[PDB]
Design a protein around this ligand. Structure first.
Ligand SMILES: Nc1ncnc2c1ncn2[C@@H]1O[C@H](COP(=O)(O)O)[C@@H](O)[C@H]1O
Ligand SMILES: Nc1ncnc2c1ncn2[C@@H]1O[C@H](COP(=O)(O)O)[C@@H](O)[C@H]1O
Ligand SMILES: Nc1ncnc2c1ncn2[C@@H]1O[C@H](COP(=O)(O)O)[C@@H](O)[C@H]1O
Ligand SMILES: [Mg+2]
Ligand SMILES: [Mg+2]
Ligand SMILES: [Mg+2]
Ligand code: NA
Ligand code: NA
Ligand code: NA
Ligand code: NA
Lengths: 238, 242, 246
């Protein structure tokens, strides 16, 4: 039901990039046209790690090649060229999300990866060792101690399917389109400051029926992102 | 109804040099104030930089050694005795990037700041938690605030942005009523220390500041009680129980 | 005095570990033997600090003497790699060992040498509490000295304090008797390595602990650090210890 991160994602709100961000109350034109076309908008939680995917039972790391640079052997474009490639020898921390097997020529169980996902109820996250094939064809977020200084306080390197966590009581952006409410920036900012989930998140990525996505980082909202300003993700209420 | 931080604040308990450690003796001024018929409201000490909203602008505190130069617009408000410094306040200087950064950003402003809007952390409607709220700076005019956030003291409170907090906002609960030591109870240093270690609010706070009807205040930092004050040893202020 | 064991030797791993010292799904032979003999197994939280003990009425730090160096004056051997295990009296430079004492600005040492700050279970076994205690109440017992200046305070403790080894009893920790042949019959449960790792990841207490130490009825002890389970230990991956639910 959720989309796949294969190209860059526009911002929910028009934001000027000062080389800081100068956010505005103006929604993305594409998002307005989609909401008026009748697409359902599912707000999901944006995590802070390194973009990956499972492709034919293997983990593939995202790599954006800039103009004129050597395309890595194995790169497969998807959407400043965006694409994915297989892991290299030096990708110690990418392979560390696999479950271990010291009696193997690789030391790894190549068919099992640790993941953080929703438990049987829809109330809390849980670490689970899943078959890597369960994530085939899906984009994931690799997170842990050695990625971004572990701003979520995760206890091990794990993958999280994008769109897993669905945000509760997030501002219904359809109320700012043709408009009942008009302060989309402040309302969203207030949701990240005073909601029960906001403090656990780096931002919000919207998943629509078109396969489109629209994101907002804490930096657009003039907010701080860090392990200090972040509550552990494993303690997030769902 | 809360006091304004204009002069250096005295300690609740007579401290002893070794580092200043609190002992089991209350401040003579606090004894005299409690006997003279004064109310004592324990508030929550937070860790940041002292400021105040004078007129409609934020003012940062600056202390001056009497044998120095007074900056333009500096306004004295008190004077220390131990160090002999001059207490006061200033209008923010160009370089106070993170002081100005507590204002609400404004795409329709020549500087990108709604100079009449600040982000502050205050008590919610019910009074059982703290919320971030964008407010008109005029509502804080005349009051002293503690500016906190990422770039101040290394954000020991785990705040999500630079915000202001009116001094005295967080009224403590179950904090020792320091009239029982002026005597029904004897160990004020043990009970006060036990409160920061084992209360539900202590773990979130840098210390305590008593606000009295006389305008007097008396403070106790964790360092007076021989405790650690750091983000590791502090639970986020925004999830403090009230 | 108290029913918990005294850390005077090295502690073996609950599970047979491989080689980075990672645990496998096989219990220690000594543990299986001890279990089958009918020993009571008490799972207790392992906390990251430094090993000490209250001897006479003084804090003593543990020091392992390598087989190629001299024994310090006042060093007591208590156990046996190739190094001895023993305890010393605190040296004048151990500023942060003495810092778990209650301060006293009127004493020669600046400390109340008869009172130490310790973290223990409160009246009702539902939470941990900091508690000023007469040091003589710990005489003979090994404690875990923890605080800001020990391992960078992965527990987020508001002060250097002592904790009697075995104070925190674990709830819902796998009962390792179901993983051992009972009257020769098949064990009721086969995957200890899996069940344990999921305890540290998804239990209510696991995320607050460095590991687990089983305190058996016969004085033996067995351990598992988060690393044995391929898990991270650090302040960011650890919830404050004083918030651990009991
Ligand atoms: N729920 C989610 N939906 C989409 N992208 C996500 C999600 N959670 C984390 N992300 C990541 O956030 C990135 C977008 O932000 P950025 O890479 O900083 O421009 C994507 O490439 C993803 O790897
Ligand atoms: N609730 C409060 N009441 C009074 N002062 C406070 C409060 N919270 C923080 N402070 C600050 O605490 C400082 C006094 O303690 P110290 O920093 O040890 O001199 C003052 O500069 C105040 O700005
Ligand atoms: N409840 C406990 N029981 C036994 N040892 C403990 C406990 N908590 C912490 N420890 C420490 O764990 C250490 C085990 O060795 P190591 O895991 O190699 O550091 C001992 O030296 C103890 O000081
Ligand atoms: Mg980015
Ligand atoms: Mg100060
Ligand atoms: Mg060891
Ligand atoms: Na990221
Ligand atoms: Na001072
Ligand atoms: Na302060
Ligand atoms: Na200051």
């Amino acid at each position: 039901k959720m989309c796949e991160v294969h190209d860059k994602i526009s911002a929910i709100l028009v934001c000027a990039h000062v080389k800081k961000y100068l956010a505005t109350n103006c929604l993305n034109p594409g998002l307005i046209s989609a909401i008026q076309a009748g697409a359902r908008v599912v707000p999901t939680a944006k995590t802070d790690g390194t973009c990956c995917r499972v492709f034919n039972g293997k983990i593939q790391k995202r790599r954006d090649i800039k103009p004129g640079r050597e395309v890595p052997e194995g790169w497969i474009q998807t959407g400043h060229l965006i694409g994915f490639m297989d892991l290299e020898k030096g990708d110690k921390w990418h392979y560390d999300c696999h479950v271990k097997d010291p009696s193997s020529p690789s030391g790894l169980d190549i068919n099992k990866v640790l993941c953080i996902t929703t438990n049987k109820a829809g109330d809390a996250l849980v670490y689970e060792e899943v078959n890597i094939a369960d994530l085939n064809g899906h984009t994931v977020e690799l997170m842990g101690p050695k990625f971004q200084s572990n701003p979520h306080g995760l206890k091990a390197h794990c993958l999280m399917r994008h769109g897993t966590v669905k945000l509760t009581d997030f501002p219904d952006l359809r109320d700012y389109v043709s408009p009942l409410k008009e302060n989309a920036l402040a309302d969203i900012r207030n949701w990240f400051l005073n909601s029960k989930q906001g403090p656990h998140l780096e931002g919000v990525v919207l998943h629509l029926d078109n396969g489109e996505m629209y994101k907002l980082h804490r930096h657009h909202l003039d907010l701080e992102w860090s392990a200090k300003s972040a509550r552990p993700l494993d303690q997030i209420p769902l």
